[PDB]
């Protein structure tokens, strides 16, 4: 009798949202439906373009029901407020959405409440102004959850999906596969933070006050994560956006999506995570996440930069190109904060920088660099990461590089922190080495025969080549 | 240094309405003056304009209904950071 989607987000051991408010920017809603009645306030903020009654509030009512609905919702408690930025045909404008986001901020300034979650179950093409407003609203401390988009395409070409400092959500079905339907389906790629149930999702139907309907979409998926987020913020109201994002990733089911459904180049960029509620089991733990940069583009001096959130530390830095035409990567300081910068080679199509960004309070981290000697550097403190770059066209708390390369070690003073280094090598397209359960991968690199790159996937270090050795640095309290 | 942007997905563009975004520290009083200045310079050129909304709280700037003819003029006003042509969003 439990809808498949609510079972799917239930963790393997388990035991809301009322201190939290969730804003919905969508179509109009039927606020008297029994799933949500008395839990949703319609603001009657309205900003919509002209067309060109049951149908008008169908989309929004369903999503309001997915988030907080008493029978079929994720966060059955939670309070909601709705803004109308989509007309009866489900069309809105960027300008209308900005006015809506601005309205939320104004409301908050005039009558402050607790943590806010804003669900934006909508998408248009990439918008500089829309992404900036989302970012700006995020730095003010508001959590934003958005739909990846339904075009079976790279979510980075869409807004607010592509917007920095926002949780972007793709859709999976009852078989945990990406939803695909002809030329339509879930978006994917490095701007998607995680997936959630978004096919065949039962919820309030605006046909009648007790009716239910199944709908599908990245909007439905995003709604599960808004509900999950409302619960997490009720239990731990002081979470910053980065702590909330690291928790959503950590408590997700991992490696359950068959990534064959995605285009080849997006498989590596797309997180294989299906959202879940945190368990009853939770004392402090080390959380890390993998952040892919934008592709550097083909310029000879091109750099890709992967950054962490203000309250995270960059513990390691790696890079990857499909050609293997690569000058490696380095950790360099910038505004008093470390970023991961990767360098394109002459004639390369471009490269990605791949940061490992972690929540580590009481950490003092620095970088130790040595120019080309093989080349070696150590933490004279625990080693959390090795990076290496070169300027040539071709070839124990210690990092070792090629004799012609510079080598960079990330070293942290982190009392209460233990780290170990695990190595693995073989004859081979890909070599793999995982930290043990209860350990967190902080760094992933290849021992210095021609490597495309290395990157962390959850707690597994992957090295890609055309005598190769994967090296994982694993830490814990 | 002020730049213009419009939606890459051509069917989703909505020409004739523009979001004018001003530099970060611009004050609401300046946004208003800048909008009026645009309307005055436009009127002298024979163009009607309408200020639909003045932004403050997230981004400073304003929303304006006008012919795109005025964009060169608008990009040169004091405080302008960039201008974006409005475009469509859709329920997902």
């Amino acid at each position: 009798s439990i809808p498949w989607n609510l079972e799917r987000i239930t963790p393997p051991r388990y035991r809301g949202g009322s201190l939290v408010e969730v804003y919905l920017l969508d179509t109009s809603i039927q606020s008297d439906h029994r799933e949500i009645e008395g839990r949703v306030m319609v603001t009657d903020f309205e900003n919509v373009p002209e067309e060109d009654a049951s149908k008008c509030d169908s989309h929004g009512t369903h999503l309001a029901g997915v988030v907080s609905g008493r029978d079929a919702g994720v966060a059955k408690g939670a309070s909601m407020r709705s803004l109308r930025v989509l007309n009866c045909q489900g069309k809105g404008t960027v300008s209308g959405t900005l006015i809506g986001l601005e309205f939320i901020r104004k409301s908050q300034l005039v009558q402050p409440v607790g943590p806010l979650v804003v669900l934006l179950p909508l998408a248009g093409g990439y918008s500089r102004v829309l992404n900036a407003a989302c970012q700006r609203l995020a730095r003010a401390g508001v959590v934003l959850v958005t739909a990846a988009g339904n075009f079976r395409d790279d979510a980075c070409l869409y807004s607010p999906a592509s917007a920095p400092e926002v949780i972007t959500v793709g859709a999976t079905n009852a078989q945990d596969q990406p939803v695909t339907l002809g030329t339509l389906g879930t978006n994917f790629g490095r701007c998607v933070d995680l997936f959630a149930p978004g096919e065949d999702i039962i919820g309030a139907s605006s046909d009648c006050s007790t009716c239910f309907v199944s709908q599908s979409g990245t909007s439905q998926a995003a709604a599960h994560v808004a509900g999950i987020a409302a619960m997490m913020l009720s239990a731990e109201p002081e979470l910053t956006l980065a702590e909330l994002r690291q928790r959503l990733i950590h408590f997700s089911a991992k490696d359950v999506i068959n990534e064959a459904w995605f285009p080849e180049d997006q498989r590596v960029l797309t997180p294989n995570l299906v959202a879940a509620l945190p368990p009853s089991t939770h004392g402090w733990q080390l959380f890390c996440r993998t952040v892919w940069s934008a592709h550097s583009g083909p310029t000879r001096m091109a750099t890709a930069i992967a950054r962490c959130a203000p309250d995270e530390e960059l513990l390691s830095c790696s890079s990857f190109s499909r050609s293997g035409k690569r000058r490696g990567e380095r950790m360099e300081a910038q505004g008093g904060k470390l970023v991961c910068r990767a360098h394109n080679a002459f004639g390369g199509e471009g490269v990605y920088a791949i940061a490992r960004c972690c929540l580590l309070p009481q950490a003092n981290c620095s970088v130790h660099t040595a120019p080309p000697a093989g080349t070696r550097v150590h933490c004279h403190h625990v080693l959390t990461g090795c990076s290496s770059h070169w300027e040539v066209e071709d070839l124990p708390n210690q990092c070792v590089g090629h004799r012609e390369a510079s080598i960079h070690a990330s070293c942290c003073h982190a009392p209460g922190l233990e780290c170990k280094v695990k190595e693995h090598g073989i004859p081979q397209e890909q070599v793999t080495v995982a930290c043990e359960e209860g350990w967190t991968l902080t760094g992933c690199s290849a021992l210095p025969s021609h490597v495309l790159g290395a990157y962390a996937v959850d707690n597994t270090c992957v090295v890609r080549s055309r005598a190769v050795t994967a090296v994982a640095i694993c830490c814990r309290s | 240094t002020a730049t213009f942007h419009r939606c890459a997905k051509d069917p989703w563009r909505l020409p004739g309405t523009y979001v004018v975004v001003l530099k970060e520290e611009t004050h609401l009083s300046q946004s208003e003056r800048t909008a009026r200045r645009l309307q005055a310079q436009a009127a002298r050129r024979g163009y009607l304009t309408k200020i639909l909304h003045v932004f403050h709280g997230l981004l400073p700037g304003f929303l304006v209904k006008m012919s795109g003819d005025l964009l060169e003029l608008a990009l040169k006003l004091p405080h302008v950071d960039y201008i974006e042509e409005d475009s469509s969003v859709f329920a997902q």
Binding site: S58, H59, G90, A123, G149, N150, F151, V179, L181, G182, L184, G185, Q215, S216, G217 | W12, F90, A91, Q92
Partner: peptide, 10 residues
């Protein structure tokens, strides 16, 4: 669907 609205337009 045009464009990915209401359940994949389906």
């Amino acid at each position: 669907x045009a464009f990915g609205x209401f359940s994949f337009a389906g």
